[PDB]
Design goal:
heterodimer; A: mainly alpha; Rhomboid-like fold; 8 helices; 70% helix; globular; B: mainly beta; rod-shaped; binds nonyl beta-D-glucopyranoside; binds chloride ion
């Protein structure tokens, strides 16, 4: 029946709640709370290393990010368990946010770094370890490649955190490689 | 603000 397990579900709820807060309070008021630490005095507010992934600035990217999260996140949770999804999510949110702030500073957000990690993870784990029962469909490979391309060449309305995305993708591929060593 |  239900495709989305507890972790898949709770992330989606978190993103919706944060999105609603941003419409009520405005993007900036919520960023000040949830953004990657933008000053040394904030460096021990440990939630900020992750909560950047919960903010979205447009209707299109929250929808697309949550669609991919629901599908890939959902597939990982179902087949490999809630723990595996939690770890891919925390590690990719941390390292994608690191790389992004490093090159472009701290004013960014969105779940797409995590989504790209899931794309990479599901693809490579499926390739190298098909008995895992996970697999990235050809159609979704094509979809993801175009979305990446669109990001890189600024084809959306909006300024893109290409650091976070590509770093996300590298994290997912790395974790899948390690997970399938055997 | 950049989006991921
Ligand atoms: C606009 C359409 C109707 C809106 C419904 C509002 C959300 C109601 C809560 O949903 C339920 O939350 C549970 C929490 O654990 C789970 C379960 O799977 C889900 O069914
Ligand atoms: C946030 C977008 C998620 C949409 C999920 C719709 C799946 C319904 C089809 O059931 C399978
Ligand atoms: C908006 C309709 C949702 C249909 C769900 C099909 C899975 C698509 C996954 O792509 C990511
Ligand atoms: C570390 C354990 C990983 C969670 C396993 C429980 C199943 C949750 C997702 O559905 C499979
Ligand atoms: Cl966005």
């Amino acid at each position: 029946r239900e495709r989305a397990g507890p972790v898949t579900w709770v992330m989606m709820i978190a993103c919706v709640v944060v999105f609603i807060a941003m419409q009520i309070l405005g993007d900036q008021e919520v960023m000040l709370w949830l953004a990657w630490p933008f000053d040394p005095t904030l460096k021990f507010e440990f939630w900020r290393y992750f909560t950047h992934a919960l903010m979205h600035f447009s209707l299109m990217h929250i929808l697309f990010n949550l669609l991919w999260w629901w599908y890939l996140g959902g597939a990982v949770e179902k087949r490999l368990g809630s723990g595996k999804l939690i770890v891919i999510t925390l590690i990719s949110a941390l390292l994608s946010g690191y790389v992004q702030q490093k090159f472009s500073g701290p004013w960014f957000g969105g779940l797409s770094g995590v989504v790209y990690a899931l794309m990479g993870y599901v693809w490579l784990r499926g390739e190298r370890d098909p008995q895992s029962g996970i697999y990235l469909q050809r159609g979704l490979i094509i979809f993801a490649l175009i979305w990446i391309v669109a990001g890189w060449f600024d084809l959306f309305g909006m300024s893109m955190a290409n650091g976070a995305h590509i770093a996300g993708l590298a994290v997912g591929l790395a974790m899948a490689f390690v997970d399938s060593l055997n | 603000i950049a989006t991921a």
